Amino acid sequence: VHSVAVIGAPFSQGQKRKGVEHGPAAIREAGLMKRLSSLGCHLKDFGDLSFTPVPKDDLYNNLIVNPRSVGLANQELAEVVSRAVSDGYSCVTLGGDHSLAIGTISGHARHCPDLCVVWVDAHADINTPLTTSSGNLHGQPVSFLLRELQDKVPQLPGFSWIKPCISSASIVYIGLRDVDPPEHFILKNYDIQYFSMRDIDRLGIQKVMERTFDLLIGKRQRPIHLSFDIDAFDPTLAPATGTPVVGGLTYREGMYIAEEIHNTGLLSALDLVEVNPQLATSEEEAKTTANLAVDVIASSFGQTREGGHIVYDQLPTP
Amino acid sequence: VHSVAVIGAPFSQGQKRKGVEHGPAAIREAGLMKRLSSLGCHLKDFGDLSFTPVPKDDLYNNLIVNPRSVGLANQELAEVVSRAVSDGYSCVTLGGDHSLAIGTISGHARHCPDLCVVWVDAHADINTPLTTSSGNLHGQPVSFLLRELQDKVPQLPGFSWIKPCISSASIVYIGLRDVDPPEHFILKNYDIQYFSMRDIDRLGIQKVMERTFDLLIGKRQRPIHLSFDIDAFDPTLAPATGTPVVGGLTYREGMYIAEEIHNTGLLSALDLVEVNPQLATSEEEAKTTANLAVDVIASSFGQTREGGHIVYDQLPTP
Amino acid sequence: NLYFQSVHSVAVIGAPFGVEHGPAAIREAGLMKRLSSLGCHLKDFGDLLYNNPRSVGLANQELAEVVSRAVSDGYSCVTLGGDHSLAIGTISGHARCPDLCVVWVDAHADITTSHGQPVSFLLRELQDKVPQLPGFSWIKPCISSASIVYIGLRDVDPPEHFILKNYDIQYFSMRDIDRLGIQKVMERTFDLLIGKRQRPIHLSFDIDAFDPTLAPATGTPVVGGLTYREGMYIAEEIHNTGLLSALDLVEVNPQLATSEEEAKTTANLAVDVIASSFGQTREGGHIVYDQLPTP
Ligand SMILES: NC[C@@H](CCC[B-](O)(O)O)[C@H](N)C(=O)O
Ligand SMILES: [Mn+2]
Ligand SMILES: [Mn+2]
Ligand SMILES: [Mn+2]
Ligand SMILES: [Mn+2]
Ligand SMILES: [Mn+2]
Ligand SMILES: [Mn+2]
Numbered sequence: 001v002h003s004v005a006v007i008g009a010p011f012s013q014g015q016k017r018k019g020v021e022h023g024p025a026a027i028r029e030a031g032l033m034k035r036l037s038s039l040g041c042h043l044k045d046f047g048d049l050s051f052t053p054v055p056k057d058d059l060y061n062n063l064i065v066n067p068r069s070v071g072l073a074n075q076e077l078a079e080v081v082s083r084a085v086s087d088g089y090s091c092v093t094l095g096g097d098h099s100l101a102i103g104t105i106s107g108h109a110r111h112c113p114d115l116c117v118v119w120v121d122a123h124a125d126i127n128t129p130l131t132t133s134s135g136n137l138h139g140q141p142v143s144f145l146l147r148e149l150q151d152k153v154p155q156l157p158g159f160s161w162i163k164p165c166i167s168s169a170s171i172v173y174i175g176l177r178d179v180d181p182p183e184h185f186i187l188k189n190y191d192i193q194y195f196s197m198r199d200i201d202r203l204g205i206q207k208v209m210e211r212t213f214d215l216l217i218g219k220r221q222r223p224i225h226l227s228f229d230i231d232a233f234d235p236t237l238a239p240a241t242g243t244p245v246v247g248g249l250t251y252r253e254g255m256y257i258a259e260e261i262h263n264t265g266l267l268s269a270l271d272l273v274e275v276n277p278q279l280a281t282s283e284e285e286a287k288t289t290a291n292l293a294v295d296v297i298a299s300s301f302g303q304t305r306e307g308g309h310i311v312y313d314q315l316p317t318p
Numbered sequence: 319v320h321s322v323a324v325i326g327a328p329f330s331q332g333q334k335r336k337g338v339e340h341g342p343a344a345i346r347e348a349g350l351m352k353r354l355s356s357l358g359c360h361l362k363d364f365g366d367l368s369f370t371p372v373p374k375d376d377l378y379n380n381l382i383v384n385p386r387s388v389g390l391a392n393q394e395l396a397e398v399v400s401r402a403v404s405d406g407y408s409c410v411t412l413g414g415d416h417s418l419a420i421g422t423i424s425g426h427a428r429h430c431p432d433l434c435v436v437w438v439d440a441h442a443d444i445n446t447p448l449t450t451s452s453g454n455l456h457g458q459p460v461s462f463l464l465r466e467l468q469d470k471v472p473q474l475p476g477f478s479w480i481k482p483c484i485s486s487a488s489i490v491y492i493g494l495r496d497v498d499p500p501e502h503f504i505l506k507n508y509d510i511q512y513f514s515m516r517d518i519d520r521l522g523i524q525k526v527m528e529r530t531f532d533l534l535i536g537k538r539q540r541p542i543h544l545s546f547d548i549d550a551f552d553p554t555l556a557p558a559t560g561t562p563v564v565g566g567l568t569y570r571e572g573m574y575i576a577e578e579i580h581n582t583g584l585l586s587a588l589d590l591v592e593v594n595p596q597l598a599t600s601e602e603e604a605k606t607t608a609n610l611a612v613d614v615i616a617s618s619f620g621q622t623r624e625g626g627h628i629v630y631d632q633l634p635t636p
Numbered sequence: 637n638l639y640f641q642s643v644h645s646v647a648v649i650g651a652p653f654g655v656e657h658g659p660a661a662i663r664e665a666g667l668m669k670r671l672s673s674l675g676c677h678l679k680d681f682g683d684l685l686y687n688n689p690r691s692v693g694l695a696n697q698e699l700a701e702v703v704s705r706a707v708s709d710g711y712s713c714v715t716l717g718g719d720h721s722l723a724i725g726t727i728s729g730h731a732r733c734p735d736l737c738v739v740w741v742d743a744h745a746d747i748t749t750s751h752g753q754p755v756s757f758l759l760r761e762l763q764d765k766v767p768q769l770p771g772f773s774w775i776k777p778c779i780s781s782a783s784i785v786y787i788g789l790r791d792v793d794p795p796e797h798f799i800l801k802n803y804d805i806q807y808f809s810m811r812d813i814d815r816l817g818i819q820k821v822m823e824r825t826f827d828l829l830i831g832k833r834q835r836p837i838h839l840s841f842d843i844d845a846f847d848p849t850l851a852p853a854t855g856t857p858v859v860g861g862l863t864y865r866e867g868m869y870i871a872e873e874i875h876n877t878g879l880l881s882a883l884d885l886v887e888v889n890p891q892l893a894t895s896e897e898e899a900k901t902t903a904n905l906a907v908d909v910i911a912s913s914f915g916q917t918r919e920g921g922h923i924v925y926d927q928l929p930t931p
Contacts, residue, residue, distance in 0.1 A: 130929040154931035179920035181637065182928065188921075198918045201869050202819045206520045234864075236554075236849075246908075247864040247918070251552075251565040252519050259516065295564075305565070306514045307442075307497030308506075315500065316448035318472035524815040554849075569847075569860035574814050613859075623811045623860075625792030626801075633748065633798065636767050 002301050004041045005089035006032070008048030009077055013066035014099025014138035017242045019278025023293075024048050024094035026240075026277040030290035032094075032297060039302040039309050044089060051076055060156050063135040070137045071158025074103030081107030081269065092297060095273030097138040097242070098125055101227045102162065105145050108269045109165035112223040115268065116216040117171040120257060121229035122245040124176060124183040124194070128152050131182035138274075142171070148190050168192045172212045174257060175200070175232035178245045197247055205253045209260040223268035226261050228296055230274045230289060240280035240289035251292070258299035270300050320619055322359045323407035324351065325398055326366030329391050331375075331384040332417025332456035335560035337596025341611075342366050342412035344558075344595040348608035350412075350615060357620045357627055362407055364398055372476070381453040382474060388455040389476025392421035396479075399425025403587065410615060413591030415456040415560075416443050419545045420480065423463050426587045427483035430541040433586065434534040435489040438575060439547035440563040442494060442501040442512070446471050449500035456592075457498075460489070466508050486510045490530045492575060493518075493550035496563045515565055523571045527578040541586035544579050544618060548592050548611055558598035558607035569610070576617030588618055639924035640675030642878075644914050647711035650683030651699050651725070653692070653718035654891020655855060659683050661890040662716045662910075665903035670911045674922060679711055686769055693771030696725035703729025707882060714910060717886030719751040719855065723840050724775065727758055730882040731778035733836040737829045738784040741870060742842035743858035745786060745807075748795035751855070751887070755784065761803050781805050785825045787813075787870060788845035791858045810860055818866045822873040836881035839874055839913060843887045843906055853893040853902035864905070871912035883913055 008024030025048070036043055051073035060067045077093070081104050084091040093104045098121070109115055119125070119142070126142040127133075128149065143153050147164040173194035179187070187194055193215050195208045203211070216222065233254055235244035249257075261267050275293050280286035295303070302309045326342030343366070354361055375386040395411070399422050402409040411422045416439070427433050437443070437460070444460040445451075446467060461467050465482040491512035497505070505512055511533050513526045521529070534540065549559040552566035567575070579585050593611050598604035613621070620627045648668065650659030660683070671678055681702055684695075699715070703726050706713040715726045720742070730736055740746070740755070747755040747762075756762050760777040786807040792800070800807055806828055808821045816824070829835065846867050848857035862870075874880050885906050893899035908916070915922040 128928065130931065152928045152930060177918040181920060181923040181925040184920040184923075185925035185928065194919075196919045197865060198869065198872065201865050204520075204522075204817075246904075247868060252515055255565060256516065256519050291564075305495040305497075305516045306512075307499055307502035310499040312499035312503040315446070315470050315503065317470060318448065522815075522817070570810055570814050573860060574811065577811065623790045623792075624809045625794060625797045628794040630794040630798035633765055633795065635765070 002041050003089045004036055004043055004301060005084035005091050006043065006045045007077070007080055007084065007091065007093045008046070009093050009096040009100045010048050011073055011096035011100045013069045014097035015136045015242055016065070017276060017279065020095065020097050020242060020274060020276040022277050023096055023273070023275035026275055026286060026290040027094050027272065027293045030287065030294045032294045035294055035298045035303070036301060039298060041301055046080060046084070049077060049080060054158070059135070060129065063132065064129050064137065064156060065135050066137065067156045068158035070099050071156065074100065074106065075161050077103030078107035082110045085111045085269065090267055091269040093269070093271045095271060095275065098229055098273045099137040099141055100273060101141040101271055102144050104269060104271050105225055105227070106162060106165060108223070108225055112268055113165070115170070115223040115225050117166055117225045117227060118212060118261065119171060119173045119227045120175050120232045121173065122175055122177050122231045122248055123229065123243065124173060124179050124187060126183050126186050127180060129154055129156055131180070133180070146190070149186070170216065172215055174208060174212065175249055177247055200253065205256045209257060213264065217264065217266065221266055224261060224264060224266045226267060226270040226300060228270065228272050230272065230293055233292065238289045238292055239285045240277050241274050242276050242279060254296055255299050255305065258296050259304060261300050262302055267300055270297065272297055319358050319360065321407045322354055322619060323362045323364060323402035323405070323409050325364045325402065325409065325411045327395055327411050327414040327418050328366055329369055329414040329418055331387040331391065332415035333454045333560055334383070335594060335597065338413065338415050338560060338592060338594040340595050341414055341591070341593035344593055344604060344608040345412050345590065345611045348605070348612045350612050353612055353616045354619060357616060359619055362402070364402065367395065367398060369394060378475065381450065382447050383453045383455065385455065385474040386476040388417050389474065392418065392424065393479050395421030396425035396428070399587065400428045403429045408585055409587040411587070411589050413589060413593070416547055416591045417455040417459050418591060419443070419459045419589055420462055422587060422589050423543055423545070424480060424483060426543050430586060432538070432540045433484065433488070433543055434540045435484060435543045435545060436530060436534070436579065437489060437491045437545045438493050438550045439491070440493055440495050440549045440566055441547065441561065442491060442497050442505060444501050444504050445498060447474055448472060449498070451498065467504070488534070490533055492526060492530065493567055495565055518571065523574045527575065531582065535582065535584065539584060542579060542582060542584045543587045544585060545589040546591070546614055548590065548607060551610060556607050556610055557603045558595050559592050560594050560597060572614060573617050573623065576614050577622060579618050580620055585618055588615065590615055637675070637923045639926065640915070641922055641924055642915055643675050643677065645677040645711045646671055646914060647679045647681060647706035647713045648716070649681040649699070649702055649706065649713065650716045651718040651722045652683060653695055653722050655717065655719050655887065655889045657890045658718050658888035659716035661888055661899070661903040662885065662906045665900070665907045667907050667910060670907055671914060674911060674915045676914055679706065679709070681706065686767070689769045690771050692721050693769065696722065697774060699725030700729035703882065704732040707733060712880055712914070713882040715884045717884065717888065720746055720842055720886045721751045721754060722886060723754040723884055724757050726882060726884050727838055727840070728775060728778065730838055733881055734778065735835050736779070736838050736881065737835045738779055738838045738840060739825065739874065740784060740786045740840050741788050741845045742786070743788060743790050743844045743861055744842070744856065745789060745792050745796040745800060747799050750793070759784070762799070783829070785829055787821065787825065788862055790860055813866065818869045822870065826877065830877065830879065834879060837874060837877065837879045838882045839880060840884045841886065841909055843885065843902065846905065851902050851905055852898040853890050854887045855889050855892065867909060868912050868918065871909050872917055875913055875915055880913055883910065885910055
């Protein structure tokens with residue numbers, strides 16, 4: 001019996017495309033709670049958080065957009081995640097853009113300092129505020145969290161509260177296929193392990209999961225933080241997303257990652273981000289993406305493709 | 319060269335979605351007979367059976383749907399299949415819902431004491447009339463056929479003619495992804511071998527086919543009954559079906575299963591079920607599903623990806 | 637960007653043999669910009685019955701002399717199609733490099749006929765089986781049986797199957813990829829073609845080798861093709877040898893598109909294959925970043 005807390009983080013200021021703030025409601029509408037309930041989960045829904053707005057919030061170094069707004073909302077979200085983690089709940093945060101991982105990972109690390117991160121995404125999201133070309137904070141969350149990158153990251157307004165909480169050996173990426181040249185340099189120079197789409201093509205997702213766990217939990221059991229960007233899946237499967245990139249995970253591969261995460265029994269927090277129902281060309285495309293998000297979450301807590309989630313031990317007789 | 323019999327079974331009373339009775343007409347219209355002719359098949363067309371309706375056949379024990387109609391249609395179907403097999407043909411039955419495997423497998427076992435079954439489906443179709451939640455008989459056919467379950471299956475009206483004819487070690491499932499808790503218990507408890515979509519994700523379809531044949535025909539040659547539900551394919555490939563489940567077989571995997579079955583030279587009967595042209599959103603969706611059904615059957619009788627079905631003896635010289 | 641993992645010299649030619657709208661569709665999808673972004677030294681050449689053997693044979697003679705000039709100057713020649721018949725011209729022109737090996741990526745063997753016969757005119761062992769066509773006398777066979785490897789085969793005609801089987805032409809059909817996986821297929825392909833010695837590689841890529849969901853705007857689409865990932869993998873491994881000498885990107889037919897999304901997706905895919913053949917990858921790393929800025 002897993003105790004699962006659901007937190008809606010209708011965060012959109014980490015990027016420029018509107019509608020990602022409607023991701024939590026779309027996921028709940030696709031039957032998230034009914035699905036987790038059927039798995040036997042003990043649920044708590046915090047509903048959607050109302051983040052303190054920052055009306056006077058100008059560009060940092062004439063590039064970084066909404067720093068105070070993103071920094072403050074993450075500060076507040078980190079308090080909610082920390083509380084849920086303290087109360088014994090596996091914390092599911094529904095996005096919202098991927099800048100929310102600053103708050104969920106920060107919050108989680110307060111009570112789980114030995115956590116490890118499995119980052120599932122088409123993107124590395126590891127640009128520093130000095131390497132970003134877009135100035136979108138959803139493309140930089142990992143830079144604020146990485147201990148080894150601290151001397152390369154300037155102090156941004158609203159971001160001072162953040163204490164880097166993950167080391168380069170404690171994060172593994174899966175699904176990479178659109179990596180900026182500064183991000184590629186960071187991954188190689190700081191020895192951050194990753195399994196790009198090319199590594200999945202060669203090894204197969206089973207070997208990718210085995211190797212990920214060898215790297216992270218090969219020495220001891222640790223709390224796992226699964227940060228899952230819906231754009232890790234091929235755009236044909238997850239169209240309702242801001243930055244789609246062709247040649248992503250199949251439905252089967254995404255289910256396989258989540259099932260392996262469930263099988264460890266170590267999942268402590270999960271982010272499901274970048275579902276933007278507004279970017280779907282049709283209502284069915286929006287529902288398809290939202291149904292996929294529920295499937296990743298439910299598989300992370302026991303949903304299988306073999307029907308082995310529920311205890312059944314005796315057949316009825318005539 | 320193969321002797322192949324074709325039987326149309328326009329039957330829908332094993333489920334609640336209207337239209338699956340039009341599956342045989344849709345498959346025939348897709349050019350099935352012309353395709354089998356082009357492969358050099360000696361063909362016998364038994365036409366499309368008209369099933370004796372049961373006007374008074376309502377809900378049994380507040381659960382079982384249409385038992386008298388399903389039992390009778392299967393009794394009639396078993397006699398036609400028995401005729402085709404005893405005449406010496408490899409029996410192709412076009413569905414119609416998956417409750418029709420009661421008739422095809424019963425009819426086939428009347429001549430093949432050592433028959434084995436390869437069941438390709440998103441579903442196990444092995445609930446008993448006591449474990450079913452829906453009461454739909456297309457989700458229960460294997461329970462009536464399996465010897466090990468005889469003491470778990472109640473006597474339904476119209477089912478007294480059925481004799482269990484297969485052992486738990488004589489059926490292998492491929493493609494499973496939507497299994498009920500009692501069905502998972504039955505599969506594990508009785509040691510029925512299955513390769514779910516997760517097993518295919520891990521092993522690959524080559525190893526799945528090798529292991530299937532090792533389990534079934536590794537000790538001795540045996541007639542093979544291929545019970546193929548079109549919903550084993552991903553819904554993007556087979557949209558015109560009643561219970562679609564995302565994350566199915568690819569076109570390539572489906573053809574590979576069919577090619578490997580052909581390569582044994584032991585195919586004795588094939589069911590191609592659950593094509594429901596009415597559930598397609600367009601004519602092209604219905605046609606794609608029908609064409610896929612024809613490709614499975616043709617590959618099961620020799621159609622290949624390398625174009626080696628037709629023998630070429632001499633190249634023209636100048 | 638000033639630093640790159642590798643610098644290649646690349647020549648681009650448009651051969652519009654609605655398949656004629658193919659080179660224009662590829663160009664409009666930003667091909668030149670993409671190759672420039674990879675640190676390539678670019679040279680754009682612009683856009684150029686028996687039993688149309690004259691017109692096909694003529695257009696191919698112009699293409700073969702343009703390809704021969706580009707490869708003579710030391711450029712890796714890229715030809716935008718147009719139908720696959722242009723491969724007679726490009727492989728002949730490139731051969732004028734005699735020890736060239738071919739990697740034919742197609743749903744079809746293109747090798748008795750009923751764009752489906754280019755390999756018959758080029759293969760040495762098939763010379764005593766091919767008749768003297770009008771405006772085809774200038775062609776001499778250049779590639780032997782053990783120098784062409786097919787990848788992606790799924791629609792092979794009975795006389796083609798006999799040719800492949802009896803002339804011992806090694807191939808990896810869709811069924812072979814299903815069994816081995818694309819990694820093993822590339823490892824085995826290179827074991828066959830360059831295991832003995834290094835050789836200029838001719839990659840003739842038909843867009844229909846990919847599944848029709850990915851490349852819908854093509855002439856002869858065949859279901860159950862290569863995924864986007866498999867095709868990129870082929871191109872990346874070809875790049876990783878450091879031997880790519882010529883490449884054809886054929887059968888993009890923008891007049892067969894039933895929507896703008898089907899038109900743009902097919903052209904974008906064709907740009908992706910070419911870019912991956914000259915260094916573009918899923919991991920990045922093609923562009924070399926020196927140092928991180930400090931606050
Ligand atoms: N959720 C699927 C269904 C069975 C589908 C039968 B099939 O489509 O395979 O024929 C369920 N287990 C049931 O018992 O009603
Ligand atoms: Mn992300
Ligand atoms: Mn992303
Ligand atoms: Mn079925
Ligand atoms: Mn089924
Ligand atoms: Mn071709
Ligand atoms: Mn082709």
